[PDB]
Scaffold this active site. Structure first.
Site, PDB file in Angstrom:
ATOM      1  CB  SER A  77       2.339   2.538   6.167  1.00  0.00           C
ATOM      2  OG  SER A  77       1.066   2.447   6.819  1.00  0.00           O
ATOM      3  N   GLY A  78       4.740   0.218   6.203  1.00  0.00           N
ATOM      4  CA  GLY A  78       5.929  -0.270   5.471  1.00  0.00           C
ATOM      5  C   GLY A  78       7.133  -0.468   6.338  1.00  0.00           C
ATOM      6  CG  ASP A  91       0.154  -4.024   2.855  1.00  0.00           C
ATOM      7  OD1 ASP A  91       0.549  -3.475   1.838  1.00  0.00           O
ATOM      8  OD2 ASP A  91      -0.094  -3.353   3.820  1.00  0.00           O
ATOM      9  N   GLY A 126       2.023   6.789   8.504  1.00  0.00           N
ATOM     10  CA  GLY A 126       3.413   7.354   8.340  1.00  0.00           C
ATOM     11  C   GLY A 126       4.431   6.252   8.718  1.00  0.00           C
ATOM     12  CG  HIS A 183      -0.509   0.361   2.697  1.00  0.00           C
ATOM     13  ND1 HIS A 183      -0.285  -0.466   3.685  1.00  0.00           N
ATOM     14  CD2 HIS A 183      -0.280   1.639   3.234  1.00  0.00           C
ATOM     15  CE1 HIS A 183       0.053   0.234   4.754  1.00  0.00           C
ATOM     16  NE2 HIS A 183       0.060   1.525   4.511  1.00  0.00           N
TER      17      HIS A 183
HETATM   18  N1  LIG Z   1      -3.138   1.515  14.243  1.00  0.00           N
HETATM   19  C1  LIG Z   1      -2.096   1.089  13.561  1.00  0.00           C
HETATM   20  N2  LIG Z   1      -1.230   0.224  14.048  1.00  0.00           N
HETATM   21  C2  LIG Z   1      -1.877   1.567  12.278  1.00  0.00           C
HETATM   22  C3  LIG Z   1      -0.657   1.252  11.624  1.00  0.00           C
HETATM   23  C4  LIG Z   1      -0.383   1.710  10.363  1.00  0.00           C
HETATM   24  C5  LIG Z   1      -1.323   2.479   9.766  1.00  0.00           C
HETATM   25  N3  LIG Z   1      -1.318   3.044   8.620  1.00  0.00           N
HETATM   26  C6  LIG Z   1      -2.436   3.683   8.498  1.00  0.00           C
HETATM   27  C7  LIG Z   1      -2.708   4.420   7.346  1.00  0.00           C
HETATM   28  C8  LIG Z   1      -3.886   5.184   7.304  1.00  0.00           C
HETATM   29  C9  LIG Z   1      -4.202   5.927   6.169  1.00  0.00           C
HETATM   30  O1  LIG Z   1      -5.260   6.542   6.130  1.00  0.00           O
HETATM   31  C10 LIG Z   1      -5.332   7.927   6.433  1.00  0.00           C
HETATM   32  F1  LIG Z   1      -4.554   8.656   5.513  1.00  0.00           F
HETATM   33  F2  LIG Z   1      -6.685   8.291   6.237  1.00  0.00           F
HETATM   34  F3  LIG Z   1      -4.939   8.099   7.788  1.00  0.00           F
HETATM   35  C11 LIG Z   1      -3.328   5.914   5.076  1.00  0.00           C
HETATM   36  C12 LIG Z   1      -2.148   5.156   5.099  1.00  0.00           C
HETATM   37  C13 LIG Z   1      -1.818   4.397   6.224  1.00  0.00           C
HETATM   38  O2  LIG Z   1      -0.643   3.632   6.179  1.00  0.00           O
HETATM   39  N4  LIG Z   1      -3.237   3.578   9.555  1.00  0.00           N
HETATM   40  C14 LIG Z   1      -2.501   2.811  10.336  1.00  0.00           C
HETATM   41  C15 LIG Z   1      -2.827   2.364  11.622  1.00  0.00           C
END
Ligand SMILES: NC(=[NH2+])c1ccc2[nH]c(-c3cc(OC(F)(F)F)ccc3[O-])nc2c1
Ligand SMILES: [Ca+2]
Ligand SMILES: [Cl-]
Length: 223
Positions: free
Chosen positions: A177-178, A84, A175, A40
């Site tokens: 992510s990855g 992913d 942020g 993603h």
């Molecule tokens: N709670 C967690 N451990 C978590 C981890 C990585 C995430 N990455 C994201 C994520 C959310 C996105 O949506 C937004 F821009 F509306 F916040 C977009 C990319 C993301 O990687 N939410 C996340 C939540």
């Protein structure tokens, strides 16, 4: 990272920042020319930034290399985020030293209770957005499959695992992510998704890397 701490400059040498004019995802260096991140996080125009601590200041130790190609898993499903994972090949190989180093892939999957280190430049507030300048760390345990499936019924596949704290307050976030989930020196997970950040009973979900080692090896061997 919400509820985490400042890692300290270059203490996580395999951490990379994927940049397109700003930091949008993290990744892990697995050899001098390949990085592993989440599918993603895919986009074109990616510059991989290695040896970073403050991502807004050039402090020394940084190596900025363009991605020559990104390979998203062929079975990646953007609706379920199953598979992913993405591999990024670098235009030039990186100079590895103590501040820039690769992390090992696992030979076996980790079990529940294993303590891991999650790091990244993602959001630090569960309610709102605060993005840090330096790298943040969080130590978190892998949860049992029963608690994970009980928290996200019908959404966990065999290529995912939950890690975190059900009491809320500590978690990875947007942020991050990855980026890497390292347990006993091996890369066991990739930050993938979760419901909000650090909410009670909504742990983070991570891509289970032990399920992809032959795919990573075969793909790197042919590209
Ligand atoms: N709670 C967690 N451990 C978590 C981890 C990585 C995430 N990455 C994201 C994520 C959310 C996105 O949506 C937004 F821009 F509306 F916040 C977009 C990319 C993301 O990687 N939410 C996340 C939540
Ligand atoms: Ca910097
Ligand atoms: Cl289920």
């Amino acid at each position: 990272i919400v509820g985490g701490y400042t890692c300290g400059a270059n203490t996580v040498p395999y951490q990379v920042s994927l940049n397109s004019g700003y930091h949008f995802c993290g990744g892990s260096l697995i050899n001098s020319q390949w990085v592993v991140s989440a599918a993603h996080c895919y986009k074109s125009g990616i510059q991989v930034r290695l040896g970073e601590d403050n991502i807004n200041v050039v402090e020394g130790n940084e190596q900025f290399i363009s991605a020559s190609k990104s390979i998203v898993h062929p079975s990646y499903n953007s609706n379920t985020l199953n598979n992913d994972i993405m591999l990024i090949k670098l235009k030039s190989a990186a100079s590895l030293n103590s501040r820039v180093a690769s992390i090992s892939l696992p030979t076996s999957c980790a079990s529940a209770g294993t303590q891991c280190l999650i790091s990244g430049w993602g959001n630090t507030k569960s309610s709102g957005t605060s993005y840090p300048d330096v790298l943040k760390c969080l130590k978190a345990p892998i949860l049992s499959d029963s608690s994970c499936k009980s928290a996200y019924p019908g959404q966990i596949t065999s290529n995912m695992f939950c890690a975190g704290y059900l009491e809320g307050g500590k978690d990875s976030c947007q942020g991050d992510s990855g980026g890497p989930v390292v347990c006993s020196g091996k890369l066991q997970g990739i930050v993938s998704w979760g419901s909000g950040c650090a909410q009670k009973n909504k742990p983070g979900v991570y891509t289970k890397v032990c399920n992809y080692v032959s795919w990573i090896k075969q793909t790197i061997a042919s590209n």
